[PDB]
């Protein structure tokens, strides 16, 4: 009551607050929030029109109705479009004009998924192949190519792909933007699993585990392979853990490197598009740690401006020094690297420390997870509990001055 | 790179108002706001959103009275209307509205100083540049260069031939 | 790992363009859309009814027949518009016969 | 017979008018005012096009006379000259 | 020579159909007049800036007519204008000694006699006569001075989209929309010519039919008097028909001299410009369409493109095409002759710029007509 009151109240001072902040806003409700939000690299600019085309994959989460992973298309405006004289308003003095022509978020492909979609990620050179994960031990493969755009009435799933190698469920997925095929899975099962389905016969179902790894005492939380390099890739586990391993290492218990993260439980990792040393990781103990690849041993830095946990980071596919953090404190946080060791008054310091630029709270639950636009500047697609999908973007004068 | 890693980890003017805002949002009936922003406070600021900002705008709901609809909108934001659509047949022999009957009726009913070859040819070359056009229909956006010959004149000899050439391709003809 | 919970069911009127600065170029309108969008048919029926009406012994033709269309939709996507800049003068969103009585009034036809 | 086709354009095509005109919501009844627009604009445009046509001395009517007509009215066409 | 395409707000986007130049003033400044389907008539200022560019100043707006105007052309002496609407009334405007006009221009004369669109409007050498065609199927005259209906001619069949006057004052030529030419004398008051098929011997009509898709069908004599030049023309070379411009000279209207073929897009107006020029250095033969002492240069707007000829060559010395999408309306020259303005009705028009000197040295004095 009281709780649901105040976030009523701070979302109604966001939603006045929005325009002095924000410069492009797409607030829409799914049938079903998403576990798992991610745009595809692919954009469709139609000649004779002012707008652009973008692809989302997402989830559902449903507790006794087929889970649909969903394949959206977002309309945004056009670039040219952003400087055009419309009218005047005598009242606010802008070029305003409410109008009616805007963009809107579009259903496109729904493919049944048994259970929830705990994470979808795309395969990076083809957006056809995308893997989820699901509640049991498998985790599935879909094309949506090879399958109808509409949800077929069978209420059983028809995954192009099944593959085992765990025991139960996990919250971890990635690909290998390098090697083609590689894919990189976790779960409870204490083991991180490995698969290459680029050997997958073309009338093959199921796929065998290819690689096992039981280095870790606890909940693997998280696994992702180098931006950069081809068989180096990092994990986060919940026993404060951060381990390195190469793939060329014989034995899969032994780590190639093993490092204590944090007092509290870790839960994701990234590394930069750009860069090929430094790593972010989130812990449960209201930090952020950077990690330089020359020496495990230090933290780079430690950001700390979360009350509680925090879940999902991601980095900026546009800009290097860059990076995005969501938690449980219905925040998503934008930290620039060029900001840091920076003198400042206590007038901006009471807020947080300058190592933050950005804050967004428009989201009335924990940010289930968000993901930046790969052709567009600074959009950023996030998907809260209360089935929330934002498509926002933060002012151009507060990153360009 | 790899290498080297592997190694080391063992009106106003529109320029003066800037770029152009959008805000929309589902739960809102107050319709998708396009518009541009100057107003300038030192209290909205991306460190502290939800700061007070006195004396630039009152801090009440407007979507309420914007948009209060609670009539029949027959709910046309989308899932329905697109994709039905009617198919019949028509009845096109009494008043025909056809090129061929249409040439036919004007012929029949106007009646000129024409050679029935002439006319016959004249329909022809009608429905060839019909059927060019319906071809050429599916061209649809196509930007144009503009083209330009110089004051090209026969005393000069350095001019360039392909332009000598498509202005010869205009060339007078005379009649005896 | 991390606690799981259930979710819930989801459920000036005339707008003249000033002799200078104004360098529009919009190429759209400068080429057919070959969009009928409006089936052919009952269209056709329609304008035999009303040449019928008017007079006998007279034919049309199917490029005429594409221009009325072209002419029907450039004006009702005109008139379409106007009301919703009417409608949003008159803070609403629901497109109503007075706005389109008034929109009509704006064009001076009414 | 040949007397009931004033309903002959279809709901569907009015929403897709709607569509293209940029307007997100539609009454319940809006559609008789829009048909019946419609048809005293095509009125129009036909009784000024066969004013032209009998003015030419001529029976068929063209789209010449029909941009002729929109001309009149006081809007273009374009892609028919 | 170069050509710019105007960016500019010329008709609020809709069509223009008709524009022409100040030929009293010969100094370098222009005064542009140009009509539009929007009811307003718009007098532009245009000049030469330190670059070259041709760019294009608001001077004044005319919007006394109640429907659109399709043709403007001001007189020899320049200080009257002319205004055709489609309300069936033809406007004579005049200079008089306001927030977004510069000056204004009072209504003088308002001639009437039509029932329905007026197409064309051409002035007499001197200006004290009127020659206007309209789709009432009749080709009318009137008196300047006096402001009153003094001719009707009505023999047309079809749609008349063009009159122009003799210089020399013993012509009229007219063309309707019937594939049909004629030319009317002065004193007679009647058919003097009507040209309509030619035979080669199977003979054809030589001109475009209803089925054209272009607005009208400007002709004008040369200032000279001694070239006619018809757009819209057909020559049937054999099964088919290709778009030319027929040239005719004072020996025989009845056979043209020559024409000029735009296979393709069609023909639709022909101007040709006031200033005179010198004999261009080229070999003797039969290439010149005809042989002066003194050439001069016009050009032809066809369905898409313009063609500039000159009078001692055979094909056009100038070339602009692919600048409009939408068919061509009119064109117009200065009276210096460094200036040719070109508009479709697209809604926005094009500047055609010549340098000096480069179209030739224009006469010392200009050569006397034989009225």
Redesign the interface.
């Given at each position: 009551a009281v709780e649901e009151r105040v976030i009523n109240e701070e979302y109604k001072i966001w939603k006045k607050n929005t325009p002095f902040l924000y410069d492009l806003v797409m607030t829409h409700a799914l049938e079903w929030p998403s576990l798992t939000a991610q745009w595809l690299p692919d954009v469709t600019r139609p000649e004779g029109k002012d707008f652009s085309i973008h692809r989302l994959v997402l989830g559902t989460h449903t507790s006794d109705e087929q889970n649909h992973l969903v394949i959206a298309s977002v309309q945004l405006p056009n670039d040219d479009a952003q400087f055009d004289a419309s009218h005047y308003d005598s009242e606010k003095g802008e070029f305003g004009g409410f109008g009616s022509v805007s963009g809107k978020i579009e259903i496109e492909i729904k493919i049944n998924h048994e259970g929830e979609v705990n994470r979808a990620r795309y395969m990076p050179q083809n957006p056809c192949i995308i893997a989820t994960k699901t509640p049991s031990s498998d985790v599935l493969v879909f094309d949506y190519t090879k399958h109808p755009s509409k949800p077929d009435p069978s209420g059983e799933c028809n995954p192009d792909l099944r593959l085992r190698g765990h025991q139960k469920e996990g919250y971890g997925l990635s690909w290998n933007p390098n090697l083609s095929g590689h894919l990189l899975s976790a779960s409870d099962d204490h083991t991180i699993c490995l698969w290459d389905i680029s050997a997958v016969p073309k009338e093959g179902k199921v796929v065998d585990a290819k690689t096992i790894f039981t280095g870790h005492t606890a909940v693997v939380e998280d696994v992702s392979w180098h931006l950069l390099h081809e068989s180096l890739f990092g994990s986060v586990a919940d026993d404060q853990k951060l381990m390195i391993w190469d793939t060329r290492s014989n034995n899969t218990s032994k780590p190639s490197h093993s490092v204590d993260a944090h007092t509290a439980e870790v839960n994701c990792l990234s590394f930069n598009p750009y860069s090929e040393f430094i790593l972010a990781t989130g812990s449960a103990d209201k930090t952020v740690a950077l990690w330089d690849l020359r020496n495990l041993k230090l933290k780079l830095h430690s950001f700390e401006s979360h009350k509680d946990e925090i879940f999902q980071v991601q980095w900026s596919p546009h800009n290097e020094t860059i990076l995005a953090s969501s938690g449980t404190d219905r925040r998503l946080n934008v930290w620039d690297l060029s900001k840091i060791g920076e003198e400042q008054s206590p007038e901006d310091a009471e807020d947080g420390p300058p190592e933050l630029l950005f804050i967004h709270g428009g989201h009335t639950a924990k940010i289930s997870d968000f993901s930046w636009n790969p052709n567009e500047p600074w959009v950023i697609c996030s998907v809260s509990e209360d089935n929330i999908m934002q498509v926002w973007q933060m002012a151009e004068n507060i990153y360009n001055d | 790179?790899?290498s080297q890693?592997?190694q080391?980890?063992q009106?106003?003017e529109?320029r003066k108002?800037?770029?152009?805002?959008?805000?929309?949002?589902?739960?809102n009936?107050?319709?998708?706001?396009?518009?541009?922003?100057?107003?300038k406070?030192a209290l909205?600021?991306?460190?502290?959103?939800?700061?007070?900002?006195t004396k630039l705008?009152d801090?009440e709901?407007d979507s309420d009275?914007?948009?209060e609809?609670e009539?029949?909108?027959?709910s046309?934001?989308?899932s329905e209307?697109?994709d039905?659509?009617?198919?019949?047949?028509?009845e096109?022999e009494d008043?025909?509205?056809?090129?061929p009957?249409?040439?036919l009726?004007?012929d029949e009913?106007?009646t000129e100083e024409?050679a029935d070859p002439?006319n016959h040819?004249?329909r022809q070359?009608?429905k060839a540049k019909?059927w060019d056009e319906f071809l050429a229909?599916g061209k649809?956006?196509?930007?144009?260069?503009?083209?330009?010959?110089?004051?090209?004149?026969?005393?000069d000899r350095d001019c360039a031939g392909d332009?000598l050439k498509?202005?010869?391709q205009?060339?007078?003809?005379?009649?005896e | 790992a991390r606690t799981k919970q259930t979710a819930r069911k989801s459920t000036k009127k005339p707008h003249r363009y000033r002799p200078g600065t104004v360098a529009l170029r919009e190429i759209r309108r400068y080429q057919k859309s070959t969009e009928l969008l409006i089936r052919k048919l009952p269209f056709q029926r329609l304008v035999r009814e009303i040449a019928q009406d008017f007079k006998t012994d007279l034919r049309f033709q199917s490029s005429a027949v594409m221009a009325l269309q072209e002419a029907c939709e450039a004006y009702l996507v005109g008139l379409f518009e106007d009301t919703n800049l009417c409608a949003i003068h008159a803070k609403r969103v629901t497109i109503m016969p007075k706005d389109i009585q008034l929109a009509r009034r704006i064009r001076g036809e009414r | 017979v040949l007397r009931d086709n004033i309903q002959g354009i279809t709901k569907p095509a009015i929403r897709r008018l709607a569509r293209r005109g940029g307007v997100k919501r539609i009454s319940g009844l809006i559609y008789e005012e829009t048909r019946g627009v419609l048809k005293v604009f095509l009125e129009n445009v036909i009784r000024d096009a066969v004013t032209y046509t009998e003015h030419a001395k001529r029976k068929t009517v063209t789209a010449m006379d029909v941009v002729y007509a929109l001309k009149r009215q006081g809007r273009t066409l374009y892609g028919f000259g | 020579m170069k050509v710019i395409t105007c960016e500019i707000a010329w008709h609020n986007k809709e069509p223009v159909y008709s524009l022409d130049f100040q030929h009293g003033t010969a100094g370098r400044i222009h005064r542009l007049a140009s009509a539009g389907v929007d009811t307003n008539v718009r007098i532009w200022k245009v000049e030469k800036g330190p670059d070259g560019k041709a760019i294009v100043e608001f001077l004044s707006n005319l919007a006394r007519h109640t429907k659109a105007v399709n043709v403007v052309r001001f007189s020899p002496t320049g200080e009257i204008l002319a205004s055709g609407g489609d309300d069936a009334v033809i406007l004579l405007w005049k200079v008089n000694d306001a927030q977004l006009n510069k000056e204004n221009w009072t209504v003088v004369k308002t001639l009437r006699g039509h029932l329905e669109d007026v197409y064309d409007i051409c002035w007499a050498t001197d200006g004290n006569l009127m020659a206007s065609a309209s789709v009432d199927n009749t080709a009318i005259i009137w008196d300047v001075s006096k402001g009153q209906k003094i001719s009707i001619f009505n023999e047309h069949k079809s749609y008349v989209q063009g009159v122009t006057w003799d210089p020399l004052g013993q012509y009229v030529a007219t063309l309707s929309c019937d594939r049909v030419l004629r030319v009317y004398s002065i004193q007679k008051k009647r058919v003097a010519f009507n040209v309509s098929k030619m035979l080669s011997a199977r003979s054809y009509r030589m001109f475009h039919d209803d089925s054209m898709k272009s607005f009208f069908r400007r002709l004008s004599f040369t200032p000279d008097g001694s070239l006619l030049l018809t757009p819209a023309g057909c020559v049937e070379s054999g099964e088919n028909v290709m778009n030319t411009t027929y040239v005719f000279s004072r020996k025989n209207l009845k056979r043209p001299i020559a024409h000029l073929p735009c296979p393709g897009k069609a023909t639709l107006a022909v101007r040709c410009c006031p200033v005179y020029f010198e004999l261009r250095p080229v070999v003797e033969t039969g290439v010149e369409l005809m042989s002066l002492p003194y050439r001069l240069v016009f050009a032809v707007a066809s369905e898409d493109s313009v063609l500039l000829y000159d009078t001692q060559q055979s094909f056009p010395f100038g070339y602009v095409s692919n600048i409009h999408y939408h068919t061509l309306s009119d064109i117009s020259w200065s009276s210096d002759g460094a200036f040719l303005a070109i508009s479709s009705t697209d809604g926005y028009c094009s500047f055609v710029t010549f340098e000096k000197d480069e179209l030739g040295i224009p006469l010392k004095e200009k050569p006397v007509l034989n009225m």
């Open positions: - | 790179l790899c890693l592997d080391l980890l009106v106003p529109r108002f800037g770029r152009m805002k959008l805000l929309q949002f589902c739960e009936h107050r319709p998708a706001y396009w518009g541009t922003w100057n107003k406070t909205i600021r991306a460190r502290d959103p939800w700061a007070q900002d705008l801090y709901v009275e914007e948009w609809e009539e029949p909108g027959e046309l934001s989308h209307g697109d039905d659509d009617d198919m019949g047949e028509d096109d008043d025909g509205f056809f090129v009957h249409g040439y009726s004007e009913g106007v024409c002439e040819k004249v070359k009608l019909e229909k649809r956006f196509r930007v144009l260069q503009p083209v330009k010959i110089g004051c090209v004149w026969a005393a332009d498509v202005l010869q205009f060339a007078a003809c005379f009649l | - | - | -």
